[PDB]
Amino acid sequence: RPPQFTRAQWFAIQHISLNPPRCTIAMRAINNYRWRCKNQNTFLRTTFANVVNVCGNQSIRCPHNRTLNNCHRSRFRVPLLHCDLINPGAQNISNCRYADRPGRRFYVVACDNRDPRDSPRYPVVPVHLDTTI
Numbered sequence: 267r268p269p270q271f272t273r274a275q276w277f278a279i280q281h282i283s284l285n286p287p288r289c290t291i292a293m294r295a296i297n298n299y300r301w302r303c304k305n306q307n308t309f310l311r312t313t314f315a316n317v318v319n320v321c322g323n324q325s326i327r328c329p330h331n332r333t334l335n336n337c338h339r340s341r342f343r344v345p346l347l348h349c350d351l352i353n354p355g356a357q358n359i360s361n362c363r364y365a366d367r368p369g370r371r372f373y374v375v376a377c378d379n380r381d382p383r384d385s386p387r388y389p390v391v392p393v394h395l396d397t398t399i
């Protein structure tokens with residue numbers, strides 16, 4: 267992750283966007299901070315506060331990280347836009363082209379205590395998007 271962002275800040279940039287433009291455009295807000303294009307990314311059309319509150323849901327096993335049990339599943343399905351890189355051989359980020367796949371699914375996030383640089387408003391924050399169901 268870019269070092270200037272805490273895990274929660276980077277989670278928000280990658281995964282929270284209420285009205286993202288088409289993927290090829292939306293993904294630039296993420297890839298501009300990287301050396302290479304992301305092969306896949308899901309934007310949950312929600313708010314940071316909302317995800318923080320899902321962190322309050324019962325602790326369950328992370329579907330994509332089965333030795334971890336600090337995951338939390340949303341109670342409701344939420345609108346989202348998934349973006350899949352169409353040209354994975356791209357060497358620069360200005361060439362990244364993405365396919366759009368809108369959907370409405372439950373999401374599962376891993377949450378942990380906040381980084382010292384994070385706001386004190388949220389002592390517990392989402393640190394990675396595990397999967398969507």
Ligand SMILES: [Fe+3]
Binds near residue numbers: 302
């Ligand atoms: Fe890579």
